[PDB]
Amino acid sequence: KKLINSQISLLIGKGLHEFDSLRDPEVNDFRTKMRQFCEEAAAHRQQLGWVEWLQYSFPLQLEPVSNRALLVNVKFEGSEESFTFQVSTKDMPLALMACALRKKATVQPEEYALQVNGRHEYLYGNYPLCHFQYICSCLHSGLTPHLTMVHSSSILAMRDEQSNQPFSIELIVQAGLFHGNEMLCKTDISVCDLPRMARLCFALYADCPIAWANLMLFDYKDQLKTGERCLYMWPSLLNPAGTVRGNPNTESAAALVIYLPEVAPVYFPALEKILELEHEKDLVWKMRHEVQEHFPEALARLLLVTKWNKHEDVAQMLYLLCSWPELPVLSALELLDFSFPDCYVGSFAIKSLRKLTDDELFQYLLQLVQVLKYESYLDCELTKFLLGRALANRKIGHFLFWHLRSEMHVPSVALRFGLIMEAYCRGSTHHMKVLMKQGEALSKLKALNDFVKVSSQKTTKPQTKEMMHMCMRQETYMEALSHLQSPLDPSTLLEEVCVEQCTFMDSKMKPLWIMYSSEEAGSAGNVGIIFKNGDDLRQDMLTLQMIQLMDVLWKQEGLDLRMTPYGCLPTGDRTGLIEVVLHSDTIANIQLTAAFNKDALLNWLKSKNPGEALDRAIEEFTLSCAGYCVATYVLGIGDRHSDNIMIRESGQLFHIDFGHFLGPFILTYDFVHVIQQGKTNNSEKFERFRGYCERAYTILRRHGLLFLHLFALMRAAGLPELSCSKDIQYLKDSLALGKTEEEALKHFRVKFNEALRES
Ligand SMILES: C[C@H]1Cc2ccccc2N1C(=O)Cc1nc(N2CCOCC2)cc(=O)[nH]1
Numbered sequence: 001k002k003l004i005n006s007q008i009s010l011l012i013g014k015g016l017h018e019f020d021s022l023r024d025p026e027v028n029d030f031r032t033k034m035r036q037f038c039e040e041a042a043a044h045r046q047q048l049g050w051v052e053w054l055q056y057s058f059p060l061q062l063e064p065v066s067n068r069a070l071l072v073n074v075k076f077e078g079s080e081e082s083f084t085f086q087v088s089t090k091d092m093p094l095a096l097m098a099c100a101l102r103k104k105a106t107v108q109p110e111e112y113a114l115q116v117n118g119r120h121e122y123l124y125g126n127y128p129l130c131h132f133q134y135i136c137s138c139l140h141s142g143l144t145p146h147l148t149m150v151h152s153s154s155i156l157a158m159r160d161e162q163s164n165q166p167f168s169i170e171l172i173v174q175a176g177l178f179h180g181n182e183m184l185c186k187t188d189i190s191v192c193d194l195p196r197m198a199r200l201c202f203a204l205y206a207d208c209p210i211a212w213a214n215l216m217l218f219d220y221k222d223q224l225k226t227g228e229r230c231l232y233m234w235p236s237l238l239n240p241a242g243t244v245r246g247n248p249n250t251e252s253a254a255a256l257v258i259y260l261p262e263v264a265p266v267y268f269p270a271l272e273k274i275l276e277l278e279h280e281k282d283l284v285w286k287m288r289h290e291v292q293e294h295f296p297e298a299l300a301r302l303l304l305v306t307k308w309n310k311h312e313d314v315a316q317m318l319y320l321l322c323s324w325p326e327l328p329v330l331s332a333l334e335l336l337d338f339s340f341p342d343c344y345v346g347s348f349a350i351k352s353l354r355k356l357t358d359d360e361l362f363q364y365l366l367q368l369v370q371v372l373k374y375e376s377y378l379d380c381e382l383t384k385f386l387l388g389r390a391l392a393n394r395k396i397g398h399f400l401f402w403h404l405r406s407e408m409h410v411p412s413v414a415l416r417f418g419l420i421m422e423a424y425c426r427g428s429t430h431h432m433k434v435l436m437k438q439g440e441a442l443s444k445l446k447a448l449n450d451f452v453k454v455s456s457q458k459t460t461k462p463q464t465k466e467m468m469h470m471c472m473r474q475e476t477y478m479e480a481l482s483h484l485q486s487p488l489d490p491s492t493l494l495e496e497v498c499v500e501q502c503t504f505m506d507s508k509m510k511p512l513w514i515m516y517s518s519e520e521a522g523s524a525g526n527v528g529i530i531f532k533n534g535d536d537l538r539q540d541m542l543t544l545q546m547i548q549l550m551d552v553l554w555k556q557e558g559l560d561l562r563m564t565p566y567g568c569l570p571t572g573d574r575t576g577l578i579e580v581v582l583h584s585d586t587i588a589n590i591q592l593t594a595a596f597n598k599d600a601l602l603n604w605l606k607s608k609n610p611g612e613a614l615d616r617a618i619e620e621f622t623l624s625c626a627g628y629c630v631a632t633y634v635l636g637i638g639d640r641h642s643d644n645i646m647i648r649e650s651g652q653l654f655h656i657d658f659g660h661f662l663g664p665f666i667l668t669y670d671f672v673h674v675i676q677q678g679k680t681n682n683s684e685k686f687e688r689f690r691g692y693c694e695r696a697y698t699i700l701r702r703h704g705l706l707f708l709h710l711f712a713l714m715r716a717a718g719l720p721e722l723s724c725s726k727d728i729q730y731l732k733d734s735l736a737l738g739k740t741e742e743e744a745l746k747h748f749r750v751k752f753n754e755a756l757r758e759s
């Protein structure tokens with residue numbers, strides 16, 4: 001009744017009064033309508049069935065002839081006593097639950113769910129036990145799974161307690177009219193001709209650019225803007241992609257007072273009113289009905305040919321779009337680009353993305369948050385979609401919050417991002433409290449890192465480590481750093497902080513290595529996190545999400561290349577978290593017993609995998625080496641050394657620290673020796689690896705457009721190595737999109753020979 005308003009303010013890092021002090025009708029209208037939208041979603045959520053609630057709160061953690069049957073440990077809610085019994089690998093959770101209730105009575109299964117001990121996870125649904133991530137990881141590490149039988153009533157109890165004339169302007173400076181990236185007229189247009197998404201872009205210069213400012217010609221209520229407007233500029237020539245809202249720093253920002261002449265109130269024609277009304281481009285526009293009927297996927301090309309300045313062509317295009325059938329995910333993601341800015345085009349693109357699954361949405365969520373930067377008005381279809389999907393799934397809501405929270409320091413998005421988070425919080429009061437615990441933990445991690453930064457300059461490395469340990473052992477710090485959901489994976493619980501296992505890197509920004517343990521979770525609760533303050537993790541997150549996509553796409557064609565796309569999450573201004581892949585070490589640390597460096601990797605794997613286990617480790621290495629050889633070549637991952645390439649004790653080879661991408665790969669004889677089983681020349685084993693590399697490269701080539709589309713949507717992020725058209729050009733060259741399957745295979749073989757030649 002009083003705290004919520006201050007709770008949101010502390011969580012978002014901005015006071016709610018700052019939105020009210022703006023005296024903006026658009027801001028207030030978004031706040032009232034989205035609060036209503038999010039509260040209704042929260043009400044529907046409180047009436048869900050116990051499994052439907054689990055599908056929201058604990059979404060299934062799944063993996064992307066037998067012969068097998070493995071052991072399991074099961075306990076109940078009240079009693080501490082556990083029952084150990086062997087079950088089948090093919091068996092479903094209901095079979096385990098029925099077996100658990102039989103052993104309980106001696107010492108109905110449909111009314112239960114299997115809680116994963118010391119983890120924010122549940123084992124439910126019609127899936128074989130081996131398909132669940134927890135059981136699979138337990139099987140691949142020789143661990144006994146610990147589960148708890150939780151009755152339907154208990155899940156509902158948890159659900160209940162977690163409730164809530166030519167255009168003219170008087171310049172009182174370069175002016176230009178835009179409908180996205182293309183000029184509507186000269187830097188020459190009628191008022192009736194003006195489209196709904198028309199932008200008036202300014203540039204103040206002396207050659208030396210000073211500042212820029214953009215504005216919408218129509219308001220959020222569809223009415224044409226009149227008359228006087230003070231434009232607070234952003235520092236810089238003409239920038240149409242930039243935000244339509246002024247600089248919040250009114251004290252130092254240069255302004256631009258302009259007057260919009262009163263032509264008559266004039267509102268843009270409504271839906272029903274619209275419905276009534278070089279040589280290649282003209283031919284495509286002529287065949288607009290044939291494209292609507294026979295080629296629906298060619299909509300993007302049809303929107304690029306239509307005259308956005310001519311109002312007759314726009315209304316003609318809109319009627320075709322109003323009757324246009326549903327388009328695939330790939331085509332819909334292409335339409336969210338700044339080249340297609342029309343509101344009705346955006347609404348059609350969102351409706352085509354309603355068929356996305358929670359897992360599909362999660363993969364593109366990073367790009368969807370980036371599209372919000374291109375949005376002109378606060379109340380848009382993308383915001384309604386993201387909020388609605390985040391309210392339906394707690395894991396989606398988690399990452400949507402963190403993706404917006406990490407950009408709060410940026411003034412251009414702080415208002416939009418802060419309002420969406422406030423709306424989400426009105427929808428989920430309990431999850432808001434859960435995220436506050438994560439925010440308070442990161443607050444103490446920042447303070448601890450600041451302390452380590454100062455202490456390192458004053459004393460030696462082991463003295464700074466004991467200094468770090470004393471700071472952690474503080475009552476407030478121990479409570480804040482412990483018993484929370486992992487921001488990198490909400491399914492993982494960060495229980496007891498292991499102060500003695502915690503350390504720092506003696507280099508520039510001094511990153512922290514934080515270790516955790518869990519009595520309840522056992523060995524699964526042993527988790528590590530790298531906290532980085534001062535280094536930017538946006539480029540690292542993108543590269544890892546692309547490697548994850550590569551892995552997903554390969555698996556969709558039946559190819560498992562045993563990749564390691566570990567979690568990376570920026571949380572604030574040059575602040576973020578990295579997931580520690582335990583039981584893994586760098587090539588450099590392994591090199592620091594092999595007589596020669598070419599034998600180092602195999603010798604290390606021999607000691608970790610003795611006997612028959614070695615053959616699997618060699619296969620794990622070969623598949624992962626092939627996967628990363630293609631991944632590093634395609635994405636253009638440079639600055640590669642022995643300290644940024646890691647290997648798991650199980651065999652898997654993986655890359656770390658992605659500071660430079662998009663402009664050849666690392667194929668050292670250290671890798672070849674493991675692939676060839678230790679033999680000087682093993683053609684059979686190397687040609688299979690070459691074959692696996694060729695297969696990996698060809699599967700990505702067919703999905704080349706998807707990589708290009710996602711990299712095009714990531715131009716909004718403001719990445720230094722991904723901002724212009726020439727940056728994405730590396731993917732066109734590396735994947736060889738113009739070439740055919742055999743033309744690119746010969747090109748890749750020369751590059752494969754080149755990486756092996758210079759070794
Ligand atoms: C060099 C290691 C040891 C260490 C100790 C304290 C703080 C940071 C770090 N480290 C790093 O920051 C390196 C580093 N490690 C990374 N890893 C992610 C995969 O799991 C293993 C760790 C990813 C990455 O991008 N950089």
